[PDB]
Amino acid sequence: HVIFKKISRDKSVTIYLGKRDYIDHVERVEPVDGVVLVDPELVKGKRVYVSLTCAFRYGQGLSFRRDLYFSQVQVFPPVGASGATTRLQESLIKKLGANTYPFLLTFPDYLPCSVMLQPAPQDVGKSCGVDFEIKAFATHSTDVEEDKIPKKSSVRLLIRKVQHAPRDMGPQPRAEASWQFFMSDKPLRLAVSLSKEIYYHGEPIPVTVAVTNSTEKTVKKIKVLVEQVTNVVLYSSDYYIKTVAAEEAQEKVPPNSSLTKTLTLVPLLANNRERRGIALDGKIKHEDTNLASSTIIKEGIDKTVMGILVSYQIKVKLTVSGLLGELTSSEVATEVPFRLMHPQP
């Protein structure tokens, strides 16, 4: 929470914000409270507005944009319907003087959080993302042109809407699968549970695996992955699935035997140098960027308005030996969903 500002090229309009990241914790979303400082000489006879846009973009030329949300207020001249100021606004107004005007722009309940991706060379889709922008600008008209908007009198700040955990949590994640292979009705059974349904970024995820092997085959390897799954749901139906964490059991399951073991995974952007083809919450090169949080779709909402859907799952893969006359080993797997986001506020 450092105060930062941006001044228009012509110095007529300056925007101040108290932070870049706005917390969505499901129950509510922190609104964008700020102030605009104007040069009274330069905005004489003009109107100054501030807008908040959430936009989905697609395309590395070819491009698509949809405004998922837009809100705008007039800050100058004062309209007189601003409501109560926040401590931040009061502080800045006191310090900066009377040419300072507060704005409050709220988020609705139906938007995604900050997410973006850049395709890897093997991916077919194009770059896309959800961006949030605060813009302050002056408008004026002449005898000729009505309500003009010069770039020199405008100023933009990019902000983020970041997913933090809600108060409650879903049921404990559990999965159960069983397989019968060709020529034997003897079952291989796998039960998997996670300690809970929401994990925070950087939090270890304990995966309990129980293998009940009634078959003649050996379980040669037990591998556990966190997979990120991304579905682009506007403009182009692109799909990505990426391993963002992986651990092997370092133990086998012989024929007619059982094994229960708990393995711990921590899905992290830092786990891999390759950052393309993964859903992130910001620019690849930027130091603050993390894996994108799970999408949380509000009840009743058409999921397409989210633009990009991000989900996570634990995948448990069992490698099973081939019997005599078989050419290769084989692999079976099951998956168990969980949600990943930032801590409760």
mmCIF file of C-alpha atoms in Angstrom:
data_model
loop_
_atom_site.group_PDB
_atom_site.id
_atom_site.type_symbol
_atom_site.label_atom_id
_atom_site.label_comp_id
_atom_site.label_asym_id
_atom_site.label_seq_id
_atom_site.Cartn_x
_atom_site.Cartn_y
_atom_site.Cartn_z
ATOM 1 C CA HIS A 1 0.000 0.000 0.000
ATOM 2 C CA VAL A 2 2.192 2.797 -1.347
ATOM 3 C CA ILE A 3 0.507 5.909 -2.767
ATOM 4 C CA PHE A 4 1.364 6.414 -6.416
ATOM 5 C CA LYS A 5 0.315 8.941 -9.009
ATOM 6 C CA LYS A 6 0.390 9.587 -12.703
ATOM 7 C CA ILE A 7 0.327 13.011 -14.346
ATOM 8 C CA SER A 8 -1.090 13.641 -17.830
ATOM 9 C CA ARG A 9 1.280 14.846 -20.550
ATOM 10 C CA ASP A 10 -0.192 18.352 -20.417
ATOM 11 C CA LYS A 11 -0.047 18.359 -16.593
ATOM 12 C CA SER A 12 -3.755 19.247 -16.293
ATOM 13 C CA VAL A 13 -4.886 15.994 -14.679
ATOM 14 C CA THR A 14 -3.094 13.901 -12.059
ATOM 15 C CA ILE A 15 -4.481 10.681 -10.608
ATOM 16 C CA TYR A 16 -3.584 9.294 -7.180
ATOM 17 C CA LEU A 17 -4.242 5.774 -5.938
ATOM 18 C CA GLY A 18 -3.427 4.182 -2.600
ATOM 19 C CA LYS A 19 -2.729 0.740 -4.033
ATOM 20 C CA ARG A 20 -2.504 -1.278 -7.240
ATOM 21 C CA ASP A 21 -4.174 -4.516 -6.151
ATOM 22 C CA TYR A 22 -7.824 -4.639 -5.127
ATOM 23 C CA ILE A 23 -8.953 -7.642 -3.144
ATOM 24 C CA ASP A 24 -11.840 -9.784 -4.311
ATOM 25 C CA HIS A 25 -12.670 -12.080 -1.403
ATOM 26 C CA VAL A 26 -15.979 -13.337 -2.838
ATOM 27 C CA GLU A 27 -18.131 -11.744 -0.103
ATOM 28 C CA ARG A 28 -17.107 -8.370 -1.472
ATOM 29 C CA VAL A 29 -14.527 -6.578 -3.579
ATOM 30 C CA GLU A 30 -12.535 -3.575 -2.361
ATOM 31 C CA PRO A 31 -13.613 -0.507 -4.338
ATOM 32 C CA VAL A 32 -11.178 1.821 -6.071
ATOM 33 C CA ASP A 33 -10.947 4.964 -3.964
ATOM 34 C CA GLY A 34 -8.686 7.710 -5.226
ATOM 35 C CA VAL A 35 -8.359 11.379 -5.983
ATOM 36 C CA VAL A 36 -7.759 13.537 -9.016
ATOM 37 C CA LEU A 37 -5.663 16.684 -8.745
ATOM 38 C CA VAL A 38 -6.400 19.230 -11.487
ATOM 39 C CA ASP A 39 -4.608 22.351 -12.675
ATOM 40 C CA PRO A 40 -7.496 24.829 -12.434
ATOM 41 C CA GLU A 41 -6.115 27.029 -15.237
ATOM 42 C CA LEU A 42 -5.884 24.100 -17.631
ATOM 43 C CA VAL A 43 -9.292 22.533 -16.890
ATOM 44 C CA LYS A 44 -11.246 25.800 -16.898
ATOM 45 C CA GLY A 45 -14.417 25.202 -18.929
ATOM 46 C CA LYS A 46 -13.741 21.472 -19.140
ATOM 47 C CA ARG A 47 -15.139 18.356 -17.494
ATOM 48 C CA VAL A 48 -12.892 15.749 -15.871
ATOM 49 C CA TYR A 49 -14.050 12.128 -15.580
ATOM 50 C CA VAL A 50 -12.639 8.986 -14.044
ATOM 51 C CA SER A 51 -13.508 5.544 -15.398
ATOM 52 C CA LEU A 52 -12.936 1.943 -14.366
ATOM 53 C CA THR A 53 -12.836 -0.661 -17.138
ATOM 54 C CA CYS A 54 -12.506 -4.417 -16.941
ATOM 55 C CA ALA A 55 -11.718 -5.769 -20.405
ATOM 56 C CA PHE A 56 -11.089 -9.165 -21.947
ATOM 57 C CA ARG A 57 -8.602 -9.003 -24.809
ATOM 58 C CA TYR A 58 -7.524 -11.653 -27.306
ATOM 59 C CA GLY A 59 -4.846 -11.471 -29.981
ATOM 60 C CA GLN A 60 -1.041 -11.271 -30.132
ATOM 61 C CA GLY A 61 -2.764 -8.147 -36.745
ATOM 62 C CA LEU A 62 -6.000 -9.597 -35.354
ATOM 63 C CA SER A 63 -7.639 -8.503 -32.098
ATOM 64 C CA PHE A 64 -10.775 -8.840 -30.013
ATOM 65 C CA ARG A 65 -11.858 -6.833 -26.979
ATOM 66 C CA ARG A 66 -14.933 -7.068 -24.763
ATOM 67 C CA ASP A 67 -15.626 -4.633 -21.922
ATOM 68 C CA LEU A 68 -16.824 -6.898 -19.101
ATOM 69 C CA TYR A 69 -17.505 -3.852 -16.925
ATOM 70 C CA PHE A 70 -17.394 -0.096 -17.327
ATOM 71 C CA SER A 71 -18.165 2.644 -14.835
ATOM 72 C CA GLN A 72 -17.475 6.358 -15.025
ATOM 73 C CA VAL A 73 -17.954 9.421 -12.790
ATOM 74 C CA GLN A 74 -17.586 13.178 -13.314
ATOM 75 C CA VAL A 75 -15.189 14.586 -10.717
ATOM 76 C CA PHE A 76 -14.920 18.105 -12.093
ATOM 77 C CA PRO A 77 -16.860 20.336 -11.857
ATOM 78 C CA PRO A 78 -18.197 18.681 -8.680
ATOM 79 C CA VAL A 79 -21.552 16.910 -9.139
ATOM 80 C CA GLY A 80 -22.305 16.793 -5.401
ATOM 81 C CA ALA A 81 -23.220 13.123 -5.049
ATOM 82 C CA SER A 82 -19.867 11.698 -4.007
ATOM 83 C CA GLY A 83 -20.850 10.237 -0.645
ATOM 84 C CA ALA A 84 -18.405 9.805 2.230
ATOM 85 C CA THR A 85 -14.642 10.028 1.713
ATOM 86 C CA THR A 86 -12.223 7.318 2.868
ATOM 87 C CA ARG A 87 -9.267 7.976 5.188
ATOM 88 C CA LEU A 88 -6.946 7.841 2.150
ATOM 89 C CA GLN A 89 -8.986 10.408 0.235
ATOM 90 C CA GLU A 90 -9.264 12.758 3.214
ATOM 91 C CA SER A 91 -5.524 12.514 3.787
ATOM 92 C CA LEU A 92 -4.633 13.316 0.171
ATOM 93 C CA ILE A 93 -7.151 16.151 -0.109
ATOM 94 C CA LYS A 94 -5.725 17.733 3.038
ATOM 95 C CA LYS A 95 -2.155 17.460 1.704
ATOM 96 C CA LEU A 96 -2.775 18.387 -1.932
ATOM 97 C CA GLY A 97 -5.291 21.195 -1.540
ATOM 98 C CA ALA A 98 -8.631 22.322 -2.907
ATOM 99 C CA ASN A 99 -8.056 21.347 -6.544
ATOM 100 C CA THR A 100 -8.255 17.726 -5.387
ATOM 101 C CA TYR A 101 -11.407 15.674 -5.996
ATOM 102 C CA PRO A 102 -12.262 12.226 -4.643
ATOM 103 C CA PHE A 103 -13.622 9.362 -6.716
ATOM 104 C CA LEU A 104 -14.942 5.952 -5.714
ATOM 105 C CA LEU A 105 -15.466 3.312 -8.361
ATOM 106 C CA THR A 106 -16.864 0.007 -7.167
ATOM 107 C CA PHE A 107 -16.535 -3.472 -8.691
ATOM 108 C CA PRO A 108 -19.624 -5.579 -9.423
ATOM 109 C CA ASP A 109 -19.953 -9.193 -8.304
ATOM 110 C CA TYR A 110 -19.809 -10.818 -11.741
ATOM 111 C CA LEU A 111 -16.233 -10.183 -12.881
ATOM 112 C CA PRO A 112 -13.189 -12.452 -13.062
ATOM 113 C CA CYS A 113 -9.907 -11.547 -11.393
ATOM 114 C CA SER A 114 -6.631 -10.527 -13.067
ATOM 115 C CA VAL A 115 -5.528 -13.240 -15.472
ATOM 116 C CA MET A 116 -3.390 -13.451 -18.563
ATOM 117 C CA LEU A 117 -1.573 -15.927 -20.719
ATOM 118 C CA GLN A 118 0.957 -16.068 -23.532
ATOM 119 C CA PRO A 119 0.937 -19.216 -25.668
ATOM 120 C CA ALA A 120 3.970 -21.517 -25.760
ATOM 121 C CA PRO A 121 5.321 -22.451 -29.218
ATOM 122 C CA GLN A 122 3.367 -25.732 -29.147
ATOM 123 C CA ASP A 123 0.113 -23.972 -28.189
ATOM 124 C CA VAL A 124 -2.298 -22.983 -30.969
ATOM 125 C CA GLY A 125 -4.144 -20.120 -29.254
ATOM 126 C CA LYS A 126 -3.149 -16.461 -29.128
ATOM 127 C CA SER A 127 -2.278 -14.235 -26.162
ATOM 128 C CA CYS A 128 -5.262 -13.140 -24.077
ATOM 129 C CA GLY A 129 -6.107 -11.678 -20.710
ATOM 130 C CA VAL A 130 -8.344 -9.707 -18.417
ATOM 131 C CA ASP A 131 -7.051 -6.180 -17.736
ATOM 132 C CA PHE A 132 -8.334 -3.509 -15.337
ATOM 133 C CA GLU A 133 -7.747 0.180 -16.000
ATOM 134 C CA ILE A 134 -8.423 3.409 -14.163
ATOM 135 C CA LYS A 135 -8.483 6.421 -16.489
ATOM 136 C CA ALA A 136 -8.892 10.122 -15.707
ATOM 137 C CA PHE A 137 -9.361 12.596 -18.534
ATOM 138 C CA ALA A 138 -10.630 16.041 -19.439
ATOM 139 C CA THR A 139 -13.261 16.697 -22.113
ATOM 140 C CA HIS A 140 -14.268 19.925 -23.778
ATOM 141 C CA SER A 141 -16.075 21.220 -26.827
ATOM 142 C CA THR A 142 -15.461 24.066 -29.257
ATOM 143 C CA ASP A 143 -17.803 25.876 -31.634
ATOM 144 C CA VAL A 144 -16.962 23.064 -34.059
ATOM 145 C CA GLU A 145 -16.205 19.864 -32.153
ATOM 146 C CA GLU A 146 -18.496 18.606 -29.369
ATOM 147 C CA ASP A 147 -16.984 16.868 -26.306
ATOM 148 C CA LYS A 148 -13.374 16.216 -27.433
ATOM 149 C CA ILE A 149 -10.877 14.060 -25.519
ATOM 150 C CA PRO A 150 -7.201 14.914 -26.143
ATOM 151 C CA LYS A 151 -4.648 12.283 -25.150
ATOM 152 C CA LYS A 152 -2.416 14.894 -23.505
ATOM 153 C CA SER A 153 -5.132 15.568 -20.929
ATOM 154 C CA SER A 154 -5.671 11.892 -20.113
ATOM 155 C CA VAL A 155 -3.886 9.562 -17.734
ATOM 156 C CA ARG A 156 -4.202 5.798 -17.204
ATOM 157 C CA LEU A 157 -3.190 3.468 -14.364
ATOM 158 C CA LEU A 158 -3.329 -0.312 -14.629
ATOM 159 C CA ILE A 159 -4.689 -2.041 -11.535
ATOM 160 C CA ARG A 160 -5.335 -5.641 -10.491
ATOM 161 C CA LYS A 161 -8.285 -7.451 -9.002
ATOM 162 C CA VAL A 162 -6.785 -10.220 -6.880
ATOM 163 C CA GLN A 163 -8.501 -13.347 -5.592
ATOM 164 C CA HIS A 164 -8.392 -13.906 -1.842
ATOM 165 C CA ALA A 165 -10.095 -16.721 0.009
ATOM 166 C CA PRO A 166 -13.715 -16.374 1.172
ATOM 167 C CA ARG A 167 -14.896 -17.185 4.708
ATOM 168 C CA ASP A 168 -16.088 -20.707 3.963
ATOM 169 C CA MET A 169 -14.698 -23.649 2.024
ATOM 170 C CA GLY A 170 -16.149 -26.562 0.040
ATOM 171 C CA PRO A 171 -16.164 -30.209 1.198
ATOM 172 C CA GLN A 172 -12.927 -32.157 1.575
ATOM 173 C CA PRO A 173 -11.776 -33.187 -1.952
ATOM 174 C CA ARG A 174 -12.015 -36.937 -2.500
ATOM 175 C CA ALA A 175 -11.828 -39.253 -5.493
ATOM 176 C CA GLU A 176 -12.024 -42.981 -5.993
ATOM 177 C CA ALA A 177 -11.298 -44.959 -9.127
ATOM 178 C CA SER A 178 -10.859 -48.576 -10.038
ATOM 179 C CA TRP A 179 -9.628 -50.351 -13.148
ATOM 180 C CA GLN A 180 -9.896 -53.867 -14.459
ATOM 181 C CA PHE A 181 -7.370 -54.562 -17.209
ATOM 182 C CA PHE A 182 -7.819 -56.730 -20.313
ATOM 183 C CA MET A 183 -8.175 -60.457 -19.507
ATOM 184 C CA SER A 184 -8.455 -60.133 -15.732
ATOM 185 C CA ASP A 185 -11.365 -59.006 -13.573
ATOM 186 C CA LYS A 186 -8.928 -58.362 -10.684
ATOM 187 C CA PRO A 187 -9.219 -54.681 -9.669
ATOM 188 C CA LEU A 188 -6.627 -51.979 -9.119
ATOM 189 C CA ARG A 189 -8.217 -49.383 -6.840
ATOM 190 C CA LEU A 190 -7.076 -45.861 -6.043
ATOM 191 C CA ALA A 191 -8.559 -43.553 -3.425
ATOM 192 C CA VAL A 192 -7.252 -39.990 -3.116
ATOM 193 C CA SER A 193 -8.021 -37.206 -0.657
ATOM 194 C CA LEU A 194 -6.680 -33.739 0.025
ATOM 195 C CA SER A 195 -6.702 -32.172 3.474
ATOM 196 C CA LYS A 196 -9.030 -29.391 2.286
ATOM 197 C CA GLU A 197 -10.702 -27.680 -0.668
ATOM 198 C CA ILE A 198 -8.880 -24.324 -0.775
ATOM 199 C CA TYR A 199 -5.118 -23.879 -0.696
ATOM 200 C CA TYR A 200 -3.208 -20.606 -0.693
ATOM 201 C CA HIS A 201 -0.393 -19.716 -3.068
ATOM 202 C CA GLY A 202 2.790 -21.183 -1.600
ATOM 203 C CA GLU A 203 0.915 -23.540 0.747
ATOM 204 C CA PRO A 204 1.912 -27.223 0.767
ATOM 205 C CA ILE A 205 -0.859 -29.533 -0.482
ATOM 206 C CA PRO A 206 -0.902 -32.931 1.254
ATOM 207 C CA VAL A 207 -2.211 -35.618 -1.068
ATOM 208 C CA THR A 208 -3.148 -38.925 0.548
ATOM 209 C CA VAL A 209 -3.121 -41.817 -1.893
ATOM 210 C CA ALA A 210 -4.391 -45.326 -1.116
ATOM 211 C CA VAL A 211 -3.623 -48.053 -3.652
ATOM 212 C CA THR A 212 -5.346 -51.421 -3.344
ATOM 213 C CA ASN A 213 -3.744 -53.660 -5.926
ATOM 214 C CA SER A 214 -5.537 -56.986 -6.369
ATOM 215 C CA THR A 215 -3.980 -57.495 -9.817
ATOM 216 C CA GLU A 216 -1.105 -59.669 -11.034
ATOM 217 C CA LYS A 217 0.717 -56.491 -12.145
ATOM 218 C CA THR A 218 3.140 -54.263 -10.226
ATOM 219 C CA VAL A 219 2.481 -50.552 -9.697
ATOM 220 C CA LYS A 220 5.953 -49.459 -10.796
ATOM 221 C CA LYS A 221 5.445 -45.769 -10.171
ATOM 222 C CA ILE A 222 3.058 -43.447 -8.353
ATOM 223 C CA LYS A 223 3.290 -39.884 -9.596
ATOM 224 C CA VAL A 224 1.334 -36.917 -8.224
ATOM 225 C CA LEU A 225 0.930 -33.650 -10.153
ATOM 226 C CA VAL A 226 -0.763 -30.332 -9.744
ATOM 227 C CA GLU A 227 -2.233 -29.438 -13.130
ATOM 228 C CA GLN A 228 -3.475 -25.996 -14.093
ATOM 229 C CA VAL A 229 -6.317 -26.128 -16.587
ATOM 230 C CA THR A 230 -7.202 -23.008 -18.579
ATOM 231 C CA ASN A 231 -10.238 -22.637 -20.818
ATOM 232 C CA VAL A 232 -10.595 -19.497 -22.916
ATOM 233 C CA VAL A 233 -14.347 -18.993 -23.190
ATOM 234 C CA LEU A 234 -14.621 -15.858 -25.276
ATOM 235 C CA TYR A 235 -13.828 -15.455 -28.959
ATOM 236 C CA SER A 236 -11.794 -18.652 -29.315
ATOM 237 C CA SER A 237 -12.218 -21.902 -27.402
ATOM 238 C CA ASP A 238 -8.606 -22.487 -26.436
ATOM 239 C CA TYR A 239 -7.541 -25.132 -23.936
ATOM 240 C CA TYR A 240 -4.342 -25.402 -21.880
ATOM 241 C CA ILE A 241 -3.274 -28.006 -19.337
ATOM 242 C CA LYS A 242 0.044 -27.583 -17.586
ATOM 243 C CA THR A 243 1.902 -29.371 -14.809
ATOM 244 C CA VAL A 244 2.898 -26.824 -12.184
ATOM 245 C CA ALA A 245 4.098 -29.283 -9.525
ATOM 246 C CA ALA A 246 5.050 -32.955 -9.409
ATOM 247 C CA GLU A 247 6.235 -35.552 -6.886
ATOM 248 C CA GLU A 248 6.808 -39.309 -7.184
ATOM 249 C CA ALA A 249 6.275 -41.680 -4.250
ATOM 250 C CA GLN A 250 9.643 -43.433 -4.606
ATOM 251 C CA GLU A 251 7.822 -46.669 -3.743
ATOM 252 C CA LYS A 252 6.164 -49.514 -5.707
ATOM 253 C CA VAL A 253 3.041 -51.591 -5.110
ATOM 254 C CA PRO A 254 3.663 -55.308 -5.750
ATOM 255 C CA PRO A 255 0.922 -57.637 -7.004
ATOM 256 C CA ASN A 256 -1.743 -58.468 -4.409
ATOM 257 C CA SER A 257 -0.677 -55.692 -2.060
ATOM 258 C CA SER A 258 -1.746 -52.275 -0.780
ATOM 259 C CA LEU A 259 -0.090 -48.969 0.062
ATOM 260 C CA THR A 260 -1.226 -45.679 1.601
ATOM 261 C CA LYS A 261 1.099 -42.685 1.456
ATOM 262 C CA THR A 262 0.870 -38.916 1.726
ATOM 263 C CA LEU A 263 2.877 -36.726 -0.639
ATOM 264 C CA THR A 264 3.186 -32.940 -0.478
ATOM 265 C CA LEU A 265 3.048 -30.631 -3.507
ATOM 266 C CA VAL A 266 3.500 -26.857 -3.778
ATOM 267 C CA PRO A 267 2.301 -25.425 -7.094
ATOM 268 C CA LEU A 268 4.507 -22.430 -7.854
ATOM 269 C CA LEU A 269 5.343 -20.309 -10.883
ATOM 270 C CA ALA A 270 8.981 -20.642 -9.782
ATOM 271 C CA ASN A 271 8.831 -24.449 -10.172
ATOM 272 C CA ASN A 272 9.505 -23.918 -13.873
ATOM 273 C CA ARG A 273 11.501 -21.509 -16.042
ATOM 274 C CA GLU A 274 8.951 -21.857 -18.857
ATOM 275 C CA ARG A 275 6.228 -19.304 -18.129
ATOM 276 C CA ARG A 276 4.386 -19.432 -21.471
ATOM 277 C CA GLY A 277 1.203 -21.496 -21.828
ATOM 278 C CA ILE A 278 0.353 -20.904 -18.151
ATOM 279 C CA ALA A 279 -2.372 -18.676 -16.685
ATOM 280 C CA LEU A 280 -0.732 -15.926 -14.613
ATOM 281 C CA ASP A 281 -2.027 -12.910 -12.678
ATOM 282 C CA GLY A 282 0.249 -10.415 -14.423
ATOM 283 C CA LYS A 283 3.094 -9.949 -16.888
ATOM 284 C CA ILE A 284 5.575 -12.807 -17.354
ATOM 285 C CA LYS A 285 8.616 -10.637 -16.693
ATOM 286 C CA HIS A 286 7.181 -8.893 -13.623
ATOM 287 C CA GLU A 287 8.453 -9.784 -10.144
ATOM 288 C CA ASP A 288 5.050 -9.709 -8.448
ATOM 289 C CA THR A 289 3.431 -12.182 -10.870
ATOM 290 C CA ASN A 290 2.021 -15.495 -9.575
ATOM 291 C CA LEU A 291 0.038 -18.384 -11.011
ATOM 292 C CA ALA A 292 -3.502 -17.205 -11.648
ATOM 293 C CA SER A 293 -5.972 -17.954 -8.847
ATOM 294 C CA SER A 294 -8.851 -20.342 -9.489
ATOM 295 C CA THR A 295 -11.830 -18.756 -11.180
ATOM 296 C CA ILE A 296 -14.768 -18.423 -8.803
ATOM 297 C CA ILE A 297 -17.980 -18.262 -10.836
ATOM 298 C CA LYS A 298 -20.964 -16.673 -9.080
ATOM 299 C CA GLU A 299 -24.151 -18.753 -8.896
ATOM 300 C CA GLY A 300 -26.330 -18.133 -11.940
ATOM 301 C CA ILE A 301 -23.614 -16.379 -13.971
ATOM 302 C CA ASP A 302 -23.006 -17.390 -17.610
ATOM 303 C CA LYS A 303 -19.415 -18.619 -17.334
ATOM 304 C CA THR A 304 -18.496 -17.081 -20.695
ATOM 305 C CA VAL A 305 -18.462 -13.608 -19.123
ATOM 306 C CA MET A 306 -15.386 -14.686 -17.180
ATOM 307 C CA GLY A 307 -13.337 -14.681 -20.398
ATOM 308 C CA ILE A 308 -10.739 -17.129 -19.129
ATOM 309 C CA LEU A 309 -11.538 -19.962 -16.713
ATOM 310 C CA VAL A 310 -8.659 -21.166 -14.550
ATOM 311 C CA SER A 311 -8.913 -24.340 -12.481
ATOM 312 C CA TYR A 312 -6.537 -26.649 -10.625
ATOM 313 C CA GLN A 313 -6.531 -30.362 -9.946
ATOM 314 C CA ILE A 314 -4.392 -33.037 -8.389
ATOM 315 C CA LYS A 315 -3.678 -35.821 -10.831
ATOM 316 C CA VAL A 316 -2.436 -39.165 -9.536
ATOM 317 C CA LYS A 317 -0.825 -41.376 -12.203
ATOM 318 C CA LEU A 318 -0.091 -45.060 -11.687
ATOM 319 C CA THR A 319 2.331 -46.857 -13.971
ATOM 320 C CA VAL A 320 1.525 -50.565 -14.116
ATOM 321 C CA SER A 321 3.788 -53.309 -15.433
ATOM 322 C CA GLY A 322 3.016 -55.354 -18.536
ATOM 323 C CA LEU A 323 2.379 -59.079 -18.142
ATOM 324 C CA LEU A 324 4.003 -61.751 -20.296
ATOM 325 C CA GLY A 325 3.167 -61.200 -23.956
ATOM 326 C CA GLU A 326 2.369 -57.519 -23.489
ATOM 327 C CA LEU A 327 4.554 -55.045 -25.399
ATOM 328 C CA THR A 328 4.638 -52.145 -22.903
ATOM 329 C CA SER A 329 3.639 -50.997 -19.438
ATOM 330 C CA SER A 330 0.514 -48.868 -19.111
ATOM 331 C CA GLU A 331 -0.708 -45.893 -17.131
ATOM 332 C CA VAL A 332 -3.980 -45.048 -15.403
ATOM 333 C CA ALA A 333 -4.932 -41.878 -13.558
ATOM 334 C CA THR A 334 -7.543 -39.952 -11.654
ATOM 335 C CA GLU A 335 -7.996 -36.283 -10.843
ATOM 336 C CA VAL A 336 -9.314 -34.358 -7.856
ATOM 337 C CA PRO A 337 -10.275 -30.672 -8.070
ATOM 338 C CA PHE A 338 -9.255 -28.040 -5.537
ATOM 339 C CA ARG A 339 -9.100 -24.241 -5.577
ATOM 340 C CA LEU A 340 -5.991 -22.092 -5.280
ATOM 341 C CA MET A 341 -5.993 -18.427 -4.266
ATOM 342 C CA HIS A 342 -4.521 -15.858 -1.886
ATOM 343 C CA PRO A 343 -5.120 -16.007 1.867
ATOM 344 C CA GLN A 344 -8.246 -14.766 3.634
ATOM 345 C CA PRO A 345 -7.884 -10.979 3.962
#
